[PDB]
Amino acid sequence: TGFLVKQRAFLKLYMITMTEQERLYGLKLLEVLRSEFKEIGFKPNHTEVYRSLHELLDDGILKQIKVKKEGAKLQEVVLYQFKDYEAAKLYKKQLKVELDRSKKLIEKALSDNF
């Protein structure tokens, strides 16, 4: 039940999958996401990406593993890993439901109005 999936939920999904694939780093993040959706036409908002990431952090799903760049003064390389992988898979499942409902909704609108 509900309308379509929200943008934060959508981005959080990708971040969880990326973490699953050991490819979730802080630096490339926004750029990697934007590059992933420029073909279709979606440009992930800057603050949306940041808020998605931190909600996953504050909610205890992800945690940040850090290593210092021996080449740059201050700041580090941030790798994200699961802190609570069970919670993540639970989230993923909820998201699957949202995505399926969204698809149906969009499809119905296309056939009903066009």
Next chain:
Amino acid sequence: TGFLVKQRAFLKLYMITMTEQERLYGLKLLEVLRSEFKEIGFKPNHTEVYRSLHELLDDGILKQIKVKKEGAKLQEVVLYQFKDYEAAKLYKKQLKVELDRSKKLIEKALSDNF
């Protein structure tokens, strides 16, 4: 370009199609819409429906034709008709683009994460 279609835009689309079909009345409106989406799981918000309708009115796309209920004290039967049908078809076309992009977006998320 953009994320998914907004709820107001989505409802406005249906109202335009309904008007096209001479079936857009003020009374049954919210209930008719909610009945149209209860199978999938979307329950159109009360104020969303009202705001969609009035944006179409204030934007000059629709106009209200009214007749008094000889059976009820005060208030009337409201039929909606196009005031600017060209503007409506223009809106419909924009909406088609939004819906197609939304579909692609949802589909990509399903295959990329599941």
